[PDB]
Amino acid sequence: MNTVPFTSAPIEVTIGIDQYSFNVKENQPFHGIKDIPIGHVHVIHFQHADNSSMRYGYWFDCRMGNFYIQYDPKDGLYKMMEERDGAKFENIVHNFKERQMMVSYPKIDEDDTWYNLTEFVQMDKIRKIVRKDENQFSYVDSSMTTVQENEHSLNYTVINFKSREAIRPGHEMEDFLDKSYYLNTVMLQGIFKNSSNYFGELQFAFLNAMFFGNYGSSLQWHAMIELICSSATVPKHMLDKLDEILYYQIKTLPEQYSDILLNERVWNICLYSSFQKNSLHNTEKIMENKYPELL
């Protein structure tokens, strides 16, 4: 298990780590977060007392390095930094011994929820969307928009069902009614190269919509779901995986936000009308139990 130490915590802040959250008050001693399952990706995010100020944060992978948080009084933000020197980092981690006041990431012995939510989300998928910089971690905030919203940007792969990209000339009806060419040839073979990269972007779209409230990310998540379901031909390993992916997303979605994070049109199509409706067995079950008002 890893630790994300804080070398300072001089300003009040509400901090999220993956699906958890806690407060650090004015003048409260605080040295970081420990017991973090190494996993393969995490998000840490920050909100100050002014509700009108943005939520901001960092996607990162413990496997890649030694990361920590330090307040920057210049920009007025908590910032993630990397310590390349292992000994210096160890010193930071063990600074202050018993006087260290740290949050413990809850034990998740059978809550593989975070793993399931991030199964295909690796840092290279993230960097595709949030442009790579000098850092091994990726900054995001609630003010960011998608390039599609624009028409600090979220560069999702644009899905448009009425575009030349989706429709081969001379196959108009065929390709509009059955999205298989668009999914398989354009998206999977052409752009994403494989289904894991496709699923990674779909999962990151969901997470960004949930954590940073970005509507364009919700649009992207729905569009990537709709694309698969509206294709008669989907690689079976994708079909079998999709139901689990969505199941955990619906399970984890904040019920207070369900009105704005869930699109009635897309879900009724996918669950009751689409080629692949029968592949969404558990997802239909959780929707019916938790959100019957949407169907």
């Binding site: 009425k162 575009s163 030349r164 429709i167 000339p169 108009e172 009806m173 509009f176």
Partner: protein
Amino acid sequence: GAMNSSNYAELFNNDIKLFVDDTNVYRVTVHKTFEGNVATKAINGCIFTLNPKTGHLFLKIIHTSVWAGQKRLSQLAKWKTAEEVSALVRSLPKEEQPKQIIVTRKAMLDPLEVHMLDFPNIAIRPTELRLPFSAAMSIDKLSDVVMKATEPQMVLFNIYDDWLDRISSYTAFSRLTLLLRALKTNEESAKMILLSDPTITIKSYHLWPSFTDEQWITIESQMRDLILTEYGRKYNVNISALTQTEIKDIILGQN
């Protein structure tokens, strides 16, 4: 209603636009096959594509050969319409291509948008008017040219005859819509009005009789009477109680 619609007013500006009505593309006669079930037999149909400004009607005849070896014809008809309308547009010189195409039925929007992707500057829009263009086969010369077709073909008509020599496009479109609405309401009554004086002939090259300006007023009044009495019986209202904007809403078919 229609008379306070900025959309409706736009038809008679100087932009080129086309109405497309797909109601008569897929037509059948009704029969029974050996299993006793309903059997349908396609007969020739047509796409009604009209420039409401010029009266030019691009009548694409849909010969029954285009259904051969195909299935789900009621769904396919909309896609075939879109295919043909887009072919038409491609065939036209650029400055003759419409800035806008208005479909009479919303089910035509997706198929036409998809077929028109090569023309991103052409806007495809629905209308909230229930225009009576489906009554186009009540015009004998149109019905006849469709039924006599032995192969796919396009026939150009001016559905305003020579009216624009004397009246404006707005007045001609209103006259057209009145006539089609009457024919849709009751074709026999509407024909008795048009044909009551056989000395006023339909020229060989026209669709409608050669009424004088004076005579058209009378004919239009009778058509209006026919249409409004049917509406009046349907809602138990005296015609005389209807306002002029109401009458136009009835004739144009405002939702």
